[PDB]
Amino acid sequence: RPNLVALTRATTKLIYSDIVATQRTNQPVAAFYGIKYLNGATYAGEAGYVDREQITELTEESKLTLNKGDLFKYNNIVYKVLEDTPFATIEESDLELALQIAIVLLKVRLFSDAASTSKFESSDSEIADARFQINKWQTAVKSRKLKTGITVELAQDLEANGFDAPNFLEDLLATEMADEINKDILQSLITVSKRYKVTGITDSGFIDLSYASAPEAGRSLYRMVCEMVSHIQKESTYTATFCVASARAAAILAASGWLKHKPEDDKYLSQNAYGFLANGLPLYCDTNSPLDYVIVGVVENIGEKEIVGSIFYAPYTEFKVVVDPESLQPSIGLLVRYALSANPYTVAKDEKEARIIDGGDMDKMAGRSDLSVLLGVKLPK
Amino acid sequence: RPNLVALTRATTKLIYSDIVATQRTNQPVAAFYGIKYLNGATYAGEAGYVDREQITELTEESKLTLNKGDLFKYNNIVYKVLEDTPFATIEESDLELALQIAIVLLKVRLFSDAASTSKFESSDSEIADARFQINKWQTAVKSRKLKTGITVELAQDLEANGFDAPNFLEDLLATEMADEINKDILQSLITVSKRYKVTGITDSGFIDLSYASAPEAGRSLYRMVCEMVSHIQKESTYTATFCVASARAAAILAASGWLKHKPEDDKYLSQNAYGFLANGLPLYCDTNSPLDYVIVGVVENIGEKEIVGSIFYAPYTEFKVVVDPESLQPSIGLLVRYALSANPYTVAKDEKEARIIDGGDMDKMAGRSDLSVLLGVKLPK
Amino acid sequence: RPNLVALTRATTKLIYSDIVATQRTNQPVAAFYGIKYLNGATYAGEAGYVDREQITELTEESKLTLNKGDLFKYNNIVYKVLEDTPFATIEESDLELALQIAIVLLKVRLFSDAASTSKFESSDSEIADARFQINKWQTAVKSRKLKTGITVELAQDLEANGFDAPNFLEDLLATEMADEINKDILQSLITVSKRYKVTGITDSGFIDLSYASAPEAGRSLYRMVCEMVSHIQKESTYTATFCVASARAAAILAASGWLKHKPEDDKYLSQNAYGFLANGLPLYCDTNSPLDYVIVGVVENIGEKEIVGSIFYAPYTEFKVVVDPESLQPSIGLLVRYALSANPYTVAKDEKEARIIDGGDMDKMAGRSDLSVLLGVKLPK
Amino acid sequence: RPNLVALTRATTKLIYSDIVATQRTNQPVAAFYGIKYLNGATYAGEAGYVDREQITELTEESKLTLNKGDLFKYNNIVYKVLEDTPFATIEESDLELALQIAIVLLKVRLFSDAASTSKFESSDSEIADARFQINKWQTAVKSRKLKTGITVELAQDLEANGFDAPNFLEDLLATEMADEINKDILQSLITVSKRYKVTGITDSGFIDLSYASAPEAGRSLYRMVCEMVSHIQKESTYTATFCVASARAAAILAASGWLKHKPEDDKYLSQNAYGFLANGLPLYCDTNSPLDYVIVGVVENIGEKEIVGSIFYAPYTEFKVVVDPESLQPSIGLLVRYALSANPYTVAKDEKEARIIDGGDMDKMAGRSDLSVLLGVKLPK
Amino acid sequence: RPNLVALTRATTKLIYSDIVATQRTNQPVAAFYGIKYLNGATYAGEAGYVDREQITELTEESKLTLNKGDLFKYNNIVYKVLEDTPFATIEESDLELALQIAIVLLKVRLFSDAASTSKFESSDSEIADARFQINKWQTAVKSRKLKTGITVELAQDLEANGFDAPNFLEDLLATEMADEINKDILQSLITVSKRYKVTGITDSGFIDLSYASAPEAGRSLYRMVCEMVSHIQKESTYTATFCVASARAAAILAASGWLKHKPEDDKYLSQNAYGFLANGLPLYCDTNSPLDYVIVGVVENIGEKEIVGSIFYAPYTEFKVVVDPESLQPSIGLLVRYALSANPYTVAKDEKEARIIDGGDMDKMAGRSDLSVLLGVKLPK
C-alpha cells in the first residue's frame, strides 16, 4: 500500500531508527535476528581448549615451576614461557597483574596457535568453534493509535488554513506518533541496558555530580562515559556506535568542551541526533526520562543486516491515516504497529528457555543487553 | 508588485527572519497559527488516563504495598513493578529521586501501553488524544515609515556620486529599514521570553559575573546558557535552535572558547548571524538593548510551515519605496508593514479568552513564550 | 595605461587593501564618501522624539510616579510600564541598571512605536528622519617615488640574471613600494583609531602585560581585544571586520591559543593576512611601529561600494616605471599615487566646519575614527 | 579462485592490514624482505671513517686542545672548530652536553664531507657504503580454520532467513576469522615491539597512572606515548605511522582531549581505526589483550612494496569456504592461511645466524622490532 | 639526460626543498641571488633622511622643546608633534617608551611623507633610494656519492625479488641519497641561523625546560618559538615561513597542545612535514643533530624566483646512476651534485670582502642568516 509507504517515510524519518537495530516484518510477529556469546581473547577451538586444560591453570603455586618453552593458560589465554621460572622476579601476588607484567617484561609470550597445514590434516584435529551463535526469535507486533486530527469548527479553521491544512494535519499527527515511538524505544533501551558498574557501581556509587558532590565542569561524567565505551569494547567484539542521554545528563552537561554541537549535520551524525560527543558517537537526547541518565551502546551490521543491537525494531506494514465521520467531527486518526524487542537469548541458557520467553518482555530483558550500558546519574537541582 | 518583491528581498535578507516563525499575510491582519499543549511521557489517551487513575498516584506510604506485576504512576509516568516491594531498599526520601533510583536499579520499569491490535479493536477502547493543538489568531499589520532619502542639494551630491547613487541610496535606506524591523522583533522576543529560572532564578539570583563576583572566563555564563537550552528540551519537544545575546552578554563575553567566530558562513549559519555558539546554535547580536542579556529559543516547522516560535512574523505585501517631492526635495520615503505576534493561547485557558486578547499585545504576552527563555546578566561594569 | 594597470594588479595585491575602505578616483583629488550618525534604538522621527519629550526623562524622583500604561524614556529608549509603580521593588541605585532589572522582571516593557497605517495616515504624523547621513569630502592624491631599480654593472648583473631580470626587477621594485604603502596605510589607521577607553582607559590604565603586571599567557589581552570588538558594536551598527597588531602586541603574544596561523589560506582570509583570531577577523601585522599596539575596526559595503571605514583609499591611474640612463646607469624609477583619508565629518558639526578641514590632515583626525579603536599595550620586553 | 579472491578482498578489509607491512606469497612460505642499519649522521664511507679516525675521538682531555680550522668527531658526527680552543669557555663536564653547547654557541660547526669531484677523483677515494642492508627470509605459511557454520535445524533457520542467509553466514564466519587473524597480528606486534625504556623504563618504571600513583586525566600517558614517537624518529629514518592500544590503555583513557574519535572515517585513517591521536597516527583499539598496553611504530614503503615494518604479513592465495555434509549437519568450514613474521635480521649479526632462526619464531624475536616500541601501562583499576 | 631528470624529480620530493631557497644551475658553481639590507619603517630617501637630521635626534633633553607642528625623528622614524610640549605629561624616563606612550596618547603622530605632486616637481626634489640591496654570488657545486647498491649474492636476492628489484634498488639508493642531502641542508641551516637572543640569549640563557628548570608542558618553548617568529617579523619584511625542530625539541614536546600532527596534507603543508604548530608554519624534523634545537625562518619569492632564504640550494644535472661489475659484483653507484650556500654578503660590508669569501663556507657564515634564527634548548632528559 504506497500510501502507507509514503506515511511511513514521513514518520520514520523522525524516529531513532539508528539507536536500535532495524529489521522489518510482514507477519503478526517479527522474526528478529541477533548475535550473542558468553565468553575475551585468542582462539575458540576445542583442540586448543583441551590443550589449555592439559597444560596448566597457572595457579600461583605453579606459576614459577614452569620453564623455558612451557605453555600455560590463564583466563583461557595461552602463553609460552620465555626463559626459566617466569614470575620468579615478579613480586606481584595477583595473577592478573603478575601476568600483565610478565608479558611486558618478556617473561611470558602471548601464544599464537596458527599452525601448519600438516598439523591440521595429519592430526585430523578438531576445528575452531564459533565465536558467536546466531539467534532468532518471534515477537508480537504491538500498536498504538492516535485520534487527534480534530475537525468540526476546526474543519472550518483548517479550511481557512487550507493552503497547508490537509497534509499539515496528517504530518502533525505523524510527528506526535514519531515522538511516542521514540519514547517507547528509549524506555526499552533504558530497561535492557546493563547497569554500568565499577567497584560497586561506577566508583562505588552512581556517578554523582550534584551540588553537594562534585559540580565540577561535567568532566567527571565525560570520563565515566568514555569508560562505558571501554566496557563495551572489553566485553564484546565492537565499539559503541551511539550514545543517548538527557540534556541534564550529558546533552547539556557535556557542553563544557565534552560535546560536539552538531558542527556538521551529514557527517557521522543523523538528522535526529542532537550532536556527538567530544569522543564521538552520535548523541541523541532523551528529554523525557526522569532519570537524566546516560546510555552507551552498539548498533551494527553484517553486510546490510542490522543484526547487532540491544533493541531491535521491526515495523509491520503491508502508518495509516483515516477519517472517522462520527457526529459533526470527522477527525483524523493514525494507526502504527511494530514489534520491539531485545535478544531473548541473553536471558536464556538454551532454546528450552528461549522458547518460553519473549524478547519484547521488558520485565525479563531488564539489564540484559550486553551491547549497552546505563549510567545512573545524580545531578544538581 | 514585482518591484516590491525585489525591495522585499533586498530588505528581509538583512533581518533575523529565522528567530521568529515566519508566516505571511495578504490581509490587514495576519492569520497566525501556532501549536500548544498543557501537560512529558507516555500516551495521551483517555484509556491511558483512566488506567493511570485506576492504579495509583504512588503515595510514598503505598510504595511498598506494590508487588511484582503491579503498575503505578508518578508525575503521570506509568511504571511496572519488577519483583516485590520496589523501593524496599531505597533510603531516598524524595520520591522523585527514589523512583529514578528504582528505575536504574531495576526495581521498577518505565511502562509502555502499546498493545495488540485486538486489544483495541475488541474492547472498543478510547484512542490517544492530541497532545498539541493548533491555535489560530489574528493580529493587525502595523507599519513604520521612513522619510530619509533626502535629495535636493543632496540630489546634487548624489548626482556627483551618480555612478552608484540611485540604487546605492535605495539599498542604504533599505538597510536602515531592515535594522529597525529587526530591532522591533528583538524587543518582542525579549518581552515574550520566559524569564529563565532555577532555584529562585538561575541558581537563586540572575547570573552575576561582575567584578565583585566572578570575572572568570565567561565559562559560568556558557554553563547557564547551556542549561537554558536544557530547560527548553525539558519542557518542550525542541532543542534550542537559536540564541541572541549582546556583546557584553555573550557575543564577546563567550569568546573565551565558547563562541565560534563565524569560521565559515556558507554552511550552518545565517548571513546576518554574528556567529554561533559552542553549543551549536546560531548566535545573533542585538547591540542595542541596555540589558546585556542572553536569549535562548526555538523556531520550527511541520513540513513547509513555520508553526513554532515564540514570536511569529507576517509581512504584508501586494517594502514600498517612493519619491515624495515636497518643496524642492524629491526625497525617498520607505514603508514597511507587517504583523508580529506571540501565540495568545499561552495566556489563555481557552478560546473564549484568546478571542478577547491579541497575540500582538506585548503587555499581556510578556514572559509567556515557553519556546524561549531570557537570562538577566550582571557584568563587570 | 595597460602596463601600469598590470603593475597595479601586481602591486595592490600586496597591501592590506581590506583594513581600509577602498574607493577609486580618476581625478587629482579623490572624492570620498562615507556614513555617520550621532546618537542606538527605535525610530528617529520627530513624532517619536516629541512623544518622548512629552512623557518623561525617567528621573529618579519620577520613576515611581509611573503606573500601568504609562510610557517613559531613558537614553532615548521608550519603555511602557507594566503594572503600577515600576521599580518599587528595585533597590538598585543606578537608574540605568535598575531599568535593566525592570526590563527583565517585567516591570517595564521595551516599547515599539509601530502602529496601524491608519494612525499614521489619519493624523498626518511625522516620519522617521535619517539615522545616518552620507558625507562627502575630497583630498589630494599623494605620492611616493623610487629610483631604486639600479642598473650599470647592475645591468650586467641583471643581464647575468637576464632570464628573469626585466620583470623581476620591476616586480621587486613594486614590492618595496607596496611595502611602504602598506605601512603608510597603517600609520593613518593607527592615527585615526579612537583610543579604546574603559573606566579611565581599558580598566583604569592601558593594558599592561609586563613583568611587573601580568606576564600570564596573553589571555588578558585576548579578553581586552574581544572587548574592543564589543566597543565597535556598541558605538556603530557594525561588528569588527578586521584586526591588526604588532608581533609583541598580539600577532605573537596572543599565540597561546587565541590566534590562528592561517590554517586555511583561501576562505574568509586575505592573502596578505598574517592569520586570523579565535574571535575571528583576519589578522594583520604591521611589524614596524614602535607602538606595539592592537587595532580593531570595520570596513563595510553597500553593493560594490566600500562606503564604511575609518580610512578610505582611492588610487589614481590613467605604477609608472621610467628608465633613465643617467650617465651610465639606466635605472628604473617607480611612481605610485593615491588618495588616503579619514572621514572629516568625525571632527565637524556640519559642512561649515567640514569645508575648512581636510580628511588627509591627520593632526585633526587623530583619535576620531569611531569605526576603529586602538589598544595601547605595555609589554614584557 | 575468483570466489576466494572476492572473499579475501572483502574480508581482510576488517584486519589491521596497515599496522603491519603487507607482502604476499604464492609459495608454502612467504619470501619476506626488510631493511636494517647499525649506527644517525653524515656519510657512511670508508674514506670518511678513516678521516674521522685520523683526527680524534674528542676525548674530554683533548676537546680543548683543538683550534680554529681543526676537525674532530664525536659519536660519528664530524665537526669543524670555530675559533680557538672550543669548549675553553664551557663549564659543562658531560661531553655530550658540552658539545651541544659548543654547537649552539658556534664554537664548533657541523661538518659536511661534500666536495668537488676533483677531490674525490684525485684522491681516488672510497665512496659511501650502504647504510641500510636489505635482508630476505622465508617463513612458513600458517593457518587457522573454522568448522562453525552450523547447519541442520540451523539450515532450517537459515532457510527461514533465506532472504540472505547463504552469504550472511559466510560473511559472519569470515568476520570472526578476520578477528582471530587480527588478534594473531596484535600478539606478534606486542611481542616483537621493543620495551620502551628511559632511565630504567619510562623514567625508572613503566608508566603508572594507578590510583596510588597518578589518576590524573590521562595527560601523562599521552606525553609518554608521544615520547615513544620521538624514539621512533630518533632511532630510525621514519616517523611513527600507526598506534595501537587497548581501550583502557588509551582508546578510552586518552579520550580526555588527547585522542580524536574518528571525526572523519576517510582522512588519514583506515576504516578499522578507532580514531587517531590528538597528535595523529590512526589509533587502533586492541580490546582483547590483558596487557592494557600502548604500541607506537612504523610501516613504510619503497614504491609499491611495504618493505618496512616490525611485523610482516603475507597471505597465501591461489579465505576458502566449503560445506561438509557430515551427518545431518552440512556446516561451513573456513580456512585462511598466511605467513606472519618479524625481520629475523634484528636478532642476527649475519647470515650464519639468520640461517638458523625464523622470522616467524616469536620466542626469539621478542623485544627486537626496532620499528616499534611498547609501553606497559599500570592503570587506575 | 632523461634518466637523471626522472630520478631527480622522483627523489628530491624527499628533501626539505622548501626550507631553503631553490634555485638551479647548469654551471660548476651556482649563481645565487638574494636580498639583504640595513634598516624597518617609512622611507629610504636621502632627502627625507636629511630632513630627519635637520629636525632633531629627539634626545630627552630636547623632547620638550618641541611644539605643535614640529617634526622629530627617532630610530629613523619621523613623527609629528600634536599640540605643544609633547611628552610634558609623560613621566617615562626612557625615550623609547615615552615615545611609545606619546604616540598612543596622541601627543605625537607617526609621520607620513606621502606628498603632493607639487612638493616633488616644484623643488625638483630627490627621490627615495632602495630599501633593499640585491646580491649575487657564486658557490661551487659539490658532489656527494654513494656506492650503496650492493649486488653479487645480493644480485641473486634481487633476481629472487625481480618483481620489484630493478627500480626498487635504485629508488632505495636514491632515498638514502635524499636523506644525506637533507641532512647536509639541515647542518647548514643550523650553522647559519642567528642565535635567537633576548637579554643575553632567550631570557638570559638558552631556554631550559629541563628537570633542573621547568619540566612544565612545553608551553614555555612554544612561547619562545612564537617569539622567534616575532624576531623575523621585526627584523625583516617577512613572517616566518617554516620551522624545523628535533623530535624531542618540538615534534613531540609540542604534542602537549601546540602542535597539530598533519590533520590535513593536501593543503598548505609539504609532504615531508611532520605537521604544523599552533602558531604554525609547517613543522619539519631533522632527527639527527644532538642539539635538540628549533629553527624558525623564511624563504620567499618574486614571481618564480626564490630570492629569499637563509640557505639556497642549486642542483646541477647534465641523480646519475652507474654500474661497476668487477668479479661477480654489478653494484650501483649514485652521484648527486649541488651548490649549497648562505648569502655571503651577510658577513661583508662590500664586494671587496664578498669576493674573497664563499656563501658555501659555513665557518664564516655561522650565525649570520638574518632570515632565520635558532634556539638552543635544554630538555627534561
Swiss-Prot record, chains A, B, C, D, E:
The keyword Transmembrane helix does not apply. Signal peptide: none annotated. Capsid protein that self-associates to form pentons, building the capsid in association with hexamers of the major capsid protein and one dodecamer of the portal protein. The capsid vertex protein self-associates to form 11 pentons, building the T=13 laevo capsid in association with 160 hexamers of the major capsid protein. It comes from the Viruses. One of its GO terms (cellular component) is viral capsid. Proteolytic cleavage at the N-terminus by the prohead core protein protease gives rise to the mature capsid vertex protein. This is Capsid vertex protein. InterPro entries: CAPSP (IPR038999), Gp23/Gp24_T4-like (IPR010762). It comes from Enterobacteria phage T4. Keywords: Capsid protein, Late protein, Virion. Belongs to the Tevenvirinae capsid vertex family. Homopentamer. Interacts with the portal protein. Interacts with the major capsid protein that forms 160 hexamers.
